[PDB]
Amino acid sequence: MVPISPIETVPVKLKPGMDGPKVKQWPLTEEKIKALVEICTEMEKEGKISKIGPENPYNTPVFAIWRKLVDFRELNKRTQDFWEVQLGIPHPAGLKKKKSVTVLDVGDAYFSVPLDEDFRKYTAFTIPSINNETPGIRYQYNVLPQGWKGSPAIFQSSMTKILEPFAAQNPDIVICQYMDDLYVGSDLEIGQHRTKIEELRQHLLRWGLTTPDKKHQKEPPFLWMGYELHPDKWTVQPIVLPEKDSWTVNDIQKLVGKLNWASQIYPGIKVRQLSKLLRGTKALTEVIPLTEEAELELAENREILKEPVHGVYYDPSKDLIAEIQKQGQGQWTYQIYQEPFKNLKTGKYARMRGAHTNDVKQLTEAVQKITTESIVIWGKTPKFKLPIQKETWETWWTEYWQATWIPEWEFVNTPPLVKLWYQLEKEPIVGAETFYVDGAANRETKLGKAGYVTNKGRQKVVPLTNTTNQKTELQAIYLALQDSGLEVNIVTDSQYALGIIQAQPDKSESELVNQIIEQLIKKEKVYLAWVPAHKGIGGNEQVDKLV
Amino acid sequence: IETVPVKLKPGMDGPKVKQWPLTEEKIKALVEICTEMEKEGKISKIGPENPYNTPVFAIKKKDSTKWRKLVDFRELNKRTQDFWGIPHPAGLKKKKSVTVLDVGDAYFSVPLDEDFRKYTAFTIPSINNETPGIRYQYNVLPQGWKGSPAIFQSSMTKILEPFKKQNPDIVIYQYMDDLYVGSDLEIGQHRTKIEELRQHLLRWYELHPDKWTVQPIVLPEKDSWTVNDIQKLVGKLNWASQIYPGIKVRQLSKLLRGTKALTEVIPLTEEAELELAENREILKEPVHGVYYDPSKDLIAEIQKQGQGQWTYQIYQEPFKNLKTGKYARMRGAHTNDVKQLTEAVQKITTESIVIWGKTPKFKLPIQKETWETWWTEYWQATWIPEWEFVNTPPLVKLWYQ
Numbered sequence: 023m024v025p026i027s028p029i030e031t032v033p034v035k036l037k038p039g040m041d042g043p044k045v046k047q048w049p050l051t052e053e054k055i056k057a058l059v060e061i062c063t064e065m066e067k068e069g070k071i072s073k074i075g076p077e078n079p080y081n082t083p084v085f086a087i088w089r090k091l092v093d094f095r096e097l098n099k100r101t102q103d104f105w106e107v108q109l110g111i112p113h114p115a116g117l118k119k120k121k122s123v124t125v126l127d128v129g130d131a132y133f134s135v136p137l138d139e140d141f142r143k144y145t146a147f148t149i150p151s152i153n154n155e156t157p158g159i160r161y162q163y164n165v166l167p168q169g170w171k172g173s174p175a176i177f178q179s180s181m182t183k184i185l186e187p188f189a190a191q192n193p194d195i196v197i198c199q200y201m202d203d204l205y206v207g208s209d210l211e212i213g214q215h216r217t218k219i220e221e222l223r224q225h226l227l228r229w230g231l232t233t234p235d236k237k238h239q240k241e242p243p244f245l246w247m248g249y250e251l252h253p254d255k256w257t258v259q260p261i262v263l264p265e266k267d268s269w270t271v272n273d274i275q276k277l278v279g280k281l282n283w284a285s286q287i288y289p290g291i292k293v294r295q296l297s298k299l300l301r302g303t304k305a306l307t308e309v310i311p312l313t314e315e316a317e318l319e320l321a322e323n324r325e326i327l328k329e330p331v332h333g334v335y336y337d338p339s340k341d342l343i344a345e346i347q348k349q350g351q352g353q354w355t356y357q358i359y360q361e362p363f364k365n366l367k368t369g370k371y372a373r374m375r376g377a378h379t380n381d382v383k384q385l386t387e388a389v390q391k392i393t394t395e396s397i398v399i400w401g402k403t404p405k406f407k408l409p410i411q412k413e414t415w416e417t418w419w420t421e422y423w424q425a426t427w428i429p430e431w432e433f434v435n436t437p438p439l440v441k442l443w444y445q446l447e448k449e450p451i452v453g454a455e456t457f458y459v460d461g462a463a464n465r466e467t468k469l470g471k472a473g474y475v476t477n478k479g480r481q482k483v484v485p486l487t488n489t490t491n492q493k494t495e496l497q498a499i500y501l502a503l504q505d506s507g508l509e510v511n512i513v514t515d516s517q518y519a520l521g522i523i524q525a526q527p528d529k530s531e532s533e534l535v536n537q538i539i540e541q542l543i544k545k546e547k548v549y550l551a552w553v554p555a556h557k558g559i560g561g562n563e564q565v566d567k568l569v
Numbered sequence: 570i571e572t573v574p575v576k577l578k579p580g581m582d583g584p585k586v587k588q589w590p591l592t593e594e595k596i597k598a599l600v601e602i603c604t605e606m607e608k609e610g611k612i613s614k615i616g617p618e619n620p621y622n623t624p625v626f627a628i629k630k631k632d633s634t635k636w637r638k639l640v641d642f643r644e645l646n647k648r649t650q651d652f653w654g655i656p657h658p659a660g661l662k663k664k665k666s667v668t669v670l671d672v673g674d675a676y677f678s679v680p681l682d683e684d685f686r687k688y689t690a691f692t693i694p695s696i697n698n699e700t701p702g703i704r705y706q707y708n709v710l711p712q713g714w715k716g717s718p719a720i721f722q723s724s725m726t727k728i729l730e731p732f733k734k735q736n737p738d739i740v741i742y743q744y745m746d747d748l749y750v751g752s753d754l755e756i757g758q759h760r761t762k763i764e765e766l767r768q769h770l771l772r773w774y775e776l777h778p779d780k781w782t783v784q785p786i787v788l789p790e791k792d793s794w795t796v797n798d799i800q801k802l803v804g805k806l807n808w809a810s811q812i813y814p815g816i817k818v819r820q821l822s823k824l825l826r827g828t829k830a831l832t833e834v835i836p837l838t839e840e841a842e843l844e845l846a847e848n849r850e851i852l853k854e855p856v857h858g859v860y861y862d863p864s865k866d867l868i869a870e871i872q873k874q875g876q877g878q879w880t881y882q883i884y885q886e887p888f889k890n891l892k893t894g895k896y897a898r899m900r901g902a903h904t905n906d907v908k909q910l911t912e913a914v915q916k917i918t919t920e921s922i923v924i925w926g927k928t929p930k931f932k933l934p935i936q937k938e939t940w941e942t943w944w945t946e947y948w949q950a951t952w953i954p955e956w957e958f959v960n961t962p963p964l965v966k967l968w969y970q
């Protein structure tokens with residue numbers, strides 16, 4: 023016999039203060055007991071388990087579905103935390119094309135990784151006796167049991183330590199671990215590739231681990247995690263949009279799942295209205311009627327999802343490019359690619375929940391998201407193509423009160439273009455009329471007034487019902503914008519309105535803010551000045567609107 | 570040569586912080602660095618039985634092309650038991666000049682407590698989540714951990730004993746991996762003395778706090794005032810009255826009576842001139858009842874003033890500023906707001922370390938996603954302060970300009 027190299031064991035403990043499991047075994051039928059006795063006898067003959075005495079006070083229930091199945095949920099609750107087997111799923115767009123990709127089945131190694139001796143006693147389980155007239159058979163595991171909390175991580179670390187020297191001394195290949203399967207890709211000749219595959223089977227055999235000499239069942243195209251992986255391209259598994267007369271909540275969640283999933287390669291997917299219907303429902307069986315906007319959106323989706331679209335694999339010798347387009351209603355879409363017309367992947371970004379916003383902030387957020395995703399998938403920031411003029415971005419970030427930055431980018435003339443819709447003056451305007459505005463409201467009756475007085479003697483006070491102080495301050499500014507020329511100076515004491523306007527929004531929840539924005543767009547020059555309230559600043563008329 | 574027993578605070582588990590993504594160049598640099606450190610026994614690979622994690626990344630300090638390894642020990646420093654202390658040198662900020670030295674390498678010669686090493690676990694990530702990452706733990710005192718200067722303190726005193734006995738006029742302070750050396754000599758004599766100290770430590774950043782002062786509130790001096798000038802003056806005085814009690818604005822607001830055009834010149838009445846002069850005299854005095862409390866957090870607020878200019882205020886209570894300053898330095902960041910902000914945060918943190926011996930909590934005028942996306946690209950210090958994000962434009966910005 024050739025001496026097998028022993029696999030180092032991982033020291034495992036229970037959670038602090040807790041103790042091993044002690045769960046009562048369910049009574050089983052005679053045939054199930056016989057089946058489990060045969061199975062456990064074979065497994066003991068192979069070395070996976072060992073018989074134990076009565077001194078072991080721990081027990082874990084056993085079932086047969088035959089097939090033996092141990093319910094380790096209690097021991098899992100009582101087992102220490104392990105490092106994650108994965109910090110995320112790989113993305114097909116990050117894979118680098120290979121001439122050859124072989125799959126090796128290392129499933130038989132799963133029961134070949136020994137368990138920490140001091141921890142084996144916690145894996146005890148009992149086979150009941152026929153008619154319960156003898157003591158049940160007592161067993162404990164000697165290897166990583168299937169279903170135990172720590173089996174995948176310990177198996178993966180053990181396999182990694184075994185593969186480490188083979189991977190080191192063969193840098194011209196790539197070895198990847200996924201569950202009980204290895205994936206070895208290389209650009210060598212098919213003969214050299216198969217040769218090094220045999221070498222890997224040898225190196226794994228030096229630990230007693232057996233890879234089947236049979237041809238593996240997996241073969242192109244690889245179906246994995248909703249993905250199709252081809253020798254030269256990738257895509258998502260076929261997305262079919264159902265044809266439903268009426269749509270329930272679970273049908274809309276299935277549809278938004280299929281559209282969010284398809285959006286990573288199919289460019290132009292929109293999910294705003296369909297997901298908007300799910301707003302505050304929390305009822306899985308509720309049938310919700312379908313707005314016309316969701317019909318147009320869904321029709322555009324069926325048009326985009328008509329014929330298949332594929333993504334290419336990553337080539338590190340070529341630059342990484344990401345182009346962004348605005349879709350409206352806070353929706354943005356982007357494509358990441360290295361060659362024109364051949365995308366690595368696509369995606370979308372929806373604006374965050376906010377009371378006020380503008381297109382430039384949203385584009386910035388989208389660029390940050392794309393940057394993070396790109397660093398995850400490819401380890402580098404792409405060069406951006408953005409629908410915004412250079413001068414626009416310079417004006418924005420130079421005049422913005424916050425610090426902001428976008429990485430290397432270039433302008434692409436693809437409407438709609440992101441632009442600045444208004445810009446406030448830095449100094450008062452000479453020759454322009456000066457509108458001192460003010461608004462006030464009663465907290466009980468919700469009655470208020472909004473108006474202005476100007477330097478030319480122009481005045482206005484409007485009464486309002488069902489209003490608040492903030493609403494009357496905004497309404498006052500709006501009135502000044504309505505009745506003034508193309509150039510106007512505006513004086514207010516509303517820290518609220520100045521806080522809103524200094525954020526430079528172009529869209530808002532409040533229709534009043536939107537009306538103010540529409541007024542600011544039509545103006546040539548607007549200077550907005552703030553003063554403290556109730557300080558006797560003449561012109562500022564808190565008493566005129568408190569009547 | 571002997572390990573000191575280190576534990577965590579009662580009821581607190583070790584840090585389990587997610588590692589953020591890194592570029593391929595930083596990953597390769599960390600691979601080289603960590604391989605070399607593993608050869609030197611400073612770190613060791615760990616198995617899956619270690620669930621703890623602390624983020625790691627790589628930087629490039631000033632005047633150097635070599636990559637450096639930074640560990641974000643903020644969570645571990647929080648969860649590490651309090652070590653005991655030395656009163657902060659109140660004379661370090663009063664000294665004419667101070668030089669900062671990186672003494673982090675000395676920490677690697679002292680072993681780390683056996684049972685505590687598992688809490689220093691860190692992960693080199695893999696591109697596209699190929700593997701769960703290359704996992705390491707520290708065997709010696711790691712740079713960035715708060716326990717490293719506390720444990721090495723006795724050894725540091727033993728090394729600096731001859732130099733401190735030779736120059737009683739030089740003040741020496743230690744914070745994290747940095748040694749602050751303050752004196753009053755000439756720049757050349759200070760540099761030769763710094764080389765003397767670095768070769769003194771070998772065998773075992775010009776900073777001038779004297780050119781820094783607190784900034785008073787100033788009012789404009791004009792011969793002719795417009796309505797807008799007076800409105801802004803009244804606004805600024807009204808703001809300052811929250812800081813200074815006797816600020817009075819009724820005689821200046823008396824001029825704003827009537828609905829006049831903003832650009833119209835208004836002459837000052839004598840009552841207005843007198844009120845303005847009294848306000849100047851009041852603003853010439855310091856703030857009443859401004860004290861430091863070591864049991865409270867330091868809050869640092871930063872305002873972007875444009876054209877590479879930034880203002881900042883360090884306080885503990887509102888309107889009770891302990892420090893105010895204006896960072897307008899241009900250092901290869903003329904087109905990058907975030908780099909300027911990051912350098913500003915580093916300089917303010919350094920000043921706060923010199924003055925009070927601890928870092929402040931920043932209120933950054935930047936969106937969370939932008940800052941968290943880019944701040945590690947321009948970070949050069951071995952420590953990291955805490956920060957929050959300001960989403961509403963503050964009105965007081967121009968009152969600090």
Ligand SMILES: Cc1c(Oc2ccccc2OCCn2ccc(=O)[nH]c2=O)cc(N(C)C(=O)CF)c2ccc(C#N)cc12
Pocket residue numbers: 112117118119120121123196197198199200204205206207240242244245246251252253254335699
């Ligand atoms: C085929 C495959 C993976 O592919 C590669 C494995 C090794 C090297 C390079 C590779 O991709 C290069 C691009 N490429 C792709 C396909 C092709 O045919 N030809 C190619 O050149 C990577 C995986 N993942 C995500 C892993 O984590 C593996 F552990 C897989 C996971 C599950 C299944 C199934 N069922 C298949 C996987």
